[PDB]
C-alpha cells in the first residue's frame, strides 16, 4: 500500500514548510520594522543631542557661566559650575547645591595656581570663599555679584 | 519624583509667543545694516 | 530488458520527502534566529527610547538652572540656508527676541526683537525700561554676546 502512504507523506510535509515559510516572511517583516526604528531613533538622539549643545554653547556665550555636570543625591541637586572669563584670573568654579527649597553655594579651588588664587581673592569678597546657603530668591542676585567681580 | 529646583515659568511663554511669524535671512540683513558704500561720491 | 517505471520511482518519493525533512529543520532554526534578532531589537528600541528621554530631561533642567540663575531661556533653534537662530526670552516686563549667526565666517550677531502680539501698554513699559535701538533688528559683535545680555538683563531688573 505505501507509495500512497509515501505521497501523502509528501503532502503533508509540503504544508507543514508553507506554514514555515510564511512565519519567515512575517518574522522578517517585523525585523525590517524594528530595523527601521532603530536607525531612525539613533539620528534622531545624535539630532537632538547637537542640537541641544548649541544652545548650551549659547547659554555659556550669553551668561558667561558653564554647566557641565550636575551631581544629584537623595539630598539635594548639584551642578558644576564655572563663572568668568580667560586672559590676574578672572574664572571661578563652585558647586551649587538645592535643598522650602534652600541653595547652597560651595568653593572649588584645588585646582588652581596660588597666583590665580591671589587675583581671585582680591576681586571677589572673602565670603566668597566659604560655604553659603541662601534662598532660591537670592540666585539671580547671587550671580550678578559673581558676575561683577570678575571681568 | 521630587523637584528641589523649582520648573520653568519662561517656558510657558514658547506656546504664547508667535516666534515663527518672521524669519529672514542672516546675510540680506547684514548687507542692509551697512547700507551702500557706492555712490556718486565713490 | 525493460524497467517498469513505477518501481524506479517509489525511491525518488522517499529522496524528496528526504530534502524536505531537511528544510524543515533548516526552516526551524531559521525562525529561531529571527525570533531571536527581533528580541534584540526590541531590547535595543526600549534602551533607545529611554536614554533619548532621559538626556532630554537633563537638558530641559540645565535650561531650568539657566532661567533662575540668569533669567533668560534660549526656546528653540532654526536654520536656513542663510543663517541660525535662536528664539529667546528674558527677564522675569519680559522680552522676547531671537538671535541670528550668518551661515561664511566673519561673525557679528544679528538681533531681531519679537514684539507683535504685545499690549499697547506693555509695550510702553518696555520701551520705558529698554533703549529705543533695541526694538529695532541690528547687530553687535560676538565680543558683545555677554555685554548684549547684562544690558538687557540690568534693563529689566533696574
Given at each position: 500500500?505505501?507509495?500512497?502512504?509515501?505521497?501523502?507523506?509528501?503532502?503533508?510535509?509540503?504544508?507543514?514548510?508553507?506554514?514555515?515559510?510564511?512565519?519567515?516572511?512575517?518574522l522578517?517583516?517585523?525585523?525590517?520594522?524594528?530595523?527601521?526604528?532603530?536607525?531612525?531613533?539613533?539620528?534622531?538622539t545624535?539630532?537632538?543631542?547637537?542640537?541641544?549643545?548649541?544652545?548650551?554653547?549659547?547659554?555659556?556665550?550669553?551668561?558667561?557661566?558653564?554647566?557641565?555636570?550636575?551631581?544629584?543625591?537623595?539630598?539635594?541637586?548639584?551642578?558644576?559650575?564655572?563663572?568668568?572669563?580667560?586672559?590676574?584670573?578672572?574664572?571661578?568654579?563652585?558647586?551649587?547645591?538645592?535643598?522650602?527649597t534652600?541653595?547652597?553655594?560651595?568653593?572649588?579651588?584645588?585646582?588652581?595656581?596660588?597666583?590665580?588664587?591671589?587675583?581671585?581673592?582680591?576681586?571677589?569678597?572673602?565670603?566668597?570663599?566659604?560655604?553659603?546657603?541662601?534662598?532660591?530668591?537670592?540666585?539671580?542676585?547671587?550671580?550678578?555679584?559673581?558676575?561683577?567681580?570678575?571681568? | 519624583?521630587?523637584?528641589?529646583?523649582?520648573?520653568?515659568?519662561?517656558?510657558?511663554?514658547?506656546?504664547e509667543?508667535?516666534?515663527?511669524?518672521?524669519?529672514?535671512?542672516?546675510?540680506?540683513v547684514?548687507?542692509?545694516?551697512?547700507?551702500?558704500?557706492?555712490?556718486?561720491?565713490?
Amino acid at each position: 500500500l505505501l507509495v500512497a502512504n509515501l505521497v501523502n507523506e509528501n503532502f503533508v510535509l509540503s504544508e507543514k514548510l508553507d506554514t514555515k515559510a510564511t512565519e519567515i516572511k512575517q518574522l522578517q517583516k517585523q525585523i525590517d520594522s524594528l530595523n527601521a526604528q532603530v536607525k531612525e531613533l539613533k539620528t534622531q538622539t545624535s539630532q537632538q543631542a547637537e542640537n541641544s549643545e548649541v544652545i548650551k554653547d549659547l547659554y555659556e556665550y550669553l551668561c558667561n557661566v558653564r554647566v557641565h555636570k550636575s551631581y544629584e543625591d537623595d539630598s539635594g541637586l548639584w551642578f558644576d559650575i564655572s563663572q568668568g572669563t580667560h586672559s590676574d584670573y578672572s574664572i571661578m568654579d563652585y558647586k551649587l547645591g538645592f535643598v522650602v527649597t534652600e541653595v547652597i553655594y560651595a568653593p572649588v579651588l584645588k585646582q588652581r595656581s596660588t597666583e590665580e588664587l591671589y587675583s581671585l581673592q582680591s576681586k571677589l569678597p572673602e565670603y566668597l570663599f566659604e560655604t553659603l546657603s541662601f534662598p532660591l530668591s537670592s540666585l539671580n542676585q547671587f550671580y550678578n555679584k559673581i558676575a561683577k567681580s570678575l571681568n | 519624583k521630587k523637584r528641589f529646583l523649582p520648573q520653568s515659568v519662561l517656558i510657558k511663554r514658547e506656546d504664547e509667543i508667535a516666534f515663527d511669524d518672521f524669519h529672514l535671512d542672516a546675510r540680506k540683513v547684514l548687507n542692509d545694516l551697512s547700507a551702500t558704500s557706492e555712490n556718486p561720491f565713490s
